């Protein structure tokens, strides 16, 4: 995890995913390992505000691949 803890679903999901060698449907366990990469702003009402964070780096270095 981001704080250094061993993410239990990520570890289990990857292992059962590697069991796709013996069972193809077991590959869906990799969805457990998928940790979303997000920054979610919240308020005292636990709602999401319209906050625009600033990334002090070039847009292209961390960006989606250009569609074909």
């Amino acid at each position: 995890s981001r704080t250094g803890h061993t993410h239990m679903p990520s570890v289990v999901g990857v292992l059962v995913f590697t069991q796709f060698w013996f069972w193809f449907p077991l590959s869906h366990f990799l969805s457990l390992a998928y940790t979303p990469t997000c920054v979610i702003g919240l308020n005292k009402d636990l709602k999401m505000p319209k906050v625009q964070y600033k990334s002090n780096c070039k847009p292209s270095t961390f960006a989606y691949p250009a569609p074909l």
Binding site: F20, W21, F22, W23, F24
Partner: protein
């Protein structure tokens, strides 16, 4: 209910030796026999034991299965603790790879009508070497299903595609009229220890001393051999100094290497004398009059 590619055929240690012995003795006749065992599940076929059908006559091909021989052998095997059904048939392919011919396909269809999971095992006793037996398990692909655009089997795993099909088998109808089932071997501690007794020398041989007259003559002859090899070894050292790196090996073709033979003579002589000396020393105290 399509059969799974991850299906495995388990051949016991006893079964493998019987087909190898029967197949080799029947070279080059495609000697056939029946495989006894049990369909454990949809993914496992165990071959506990096999027995060989007799050859009706001359001809290098698989003959028809003799029903009287099969039934009364199966009946009589049930008396001695073998109530195992027929899970397929085995036959030999003496040297030309493991595949199924036109006659083999017809023979397998006879088993497929009775048992839908019957397995055709082909054993190559000629191409089989120590540590690697050329074997393969086949089951027929139905023409009706594959022609319409259906795979013969479902692939839910990686297990069935670990062995790359041989070109000889692919030529003779593999993946077209029949498919290969991966073969795993069931070996236990008991049978494995029993086979370890092969070539196990008697305890008498270990303490037995070689004849000293022949041992000295062998000592004499081999040392005399190094006398000439050493003389040739000196020439080999000077020759290779003034000699181009393209002929480092081409010039060694067809001419004996004194260095290689000197090592072999040294290695042979070192084990011959050390063992004889140690055996003599051990026998000095082990067999003592006091």
């Amino acid at each position: 209910p399509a059969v799974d590619t991850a299906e495995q055929v388990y051949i016991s240690s006893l079964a493998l030796l019987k087909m190898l012995k029967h197949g080799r003795a029947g070279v080059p006749m495609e000697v056939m026999g029946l495989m006894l065992g049990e369909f454990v599940d949809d993914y496992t076929v165990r071959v506990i034991d096999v027995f060989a059908m007799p050859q009706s006559g001359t001809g290098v091909s698989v003959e028809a299965v003799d029903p009287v021989f099969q039934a009364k052998m199966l009946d009589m095997l049930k008396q001695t603790g073998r109530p195992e059904m027929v899970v397929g048939w085995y036959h030999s392919h003496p040297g030309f790879g493991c595949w199924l011919s036109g006659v083999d396909i017809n023979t397998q269809q006879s088993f497929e009508a009775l048992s839908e999971r019957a397995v055709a095992v082909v054993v190559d006793p000629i191409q089989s070497v120590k540590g690697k037996v050329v074997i393969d398990a086949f089951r027929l692909i139905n023409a009706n299903m594959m022609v319409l655009g259906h795979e013969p089997r479902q692939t839910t795993s990686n297990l069935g595609h670990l062995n790359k099909p041989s070109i000889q088998a692919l030529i003779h109808g593999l993946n077209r009229h029949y498919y290969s089932i991966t073969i795993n071997y069931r070996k236990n501690e008991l049978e494995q220890k029993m086979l370890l007794n092969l070539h196990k020398k008697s305890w008498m041989e270990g303490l037995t001393l070689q004849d000293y007259s022949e041992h000295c003559k062998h000592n004499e002859s081999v040392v005399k051999e190094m006398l000439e090899l050493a003389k040739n070894y000196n020439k080999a050292v000077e020759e290779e100094d003034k000699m181009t790196p393209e002929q480092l090996a081409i010039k060694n073709v067809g001419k004996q290497d004194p260095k290689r033979h000197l090592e072999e003579h040294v290695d042979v002589l070192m084990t011959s004398n050390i063992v004889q000396c140690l055996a003599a020393m051990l026998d000095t105290v082990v067999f003592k009059l006091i």
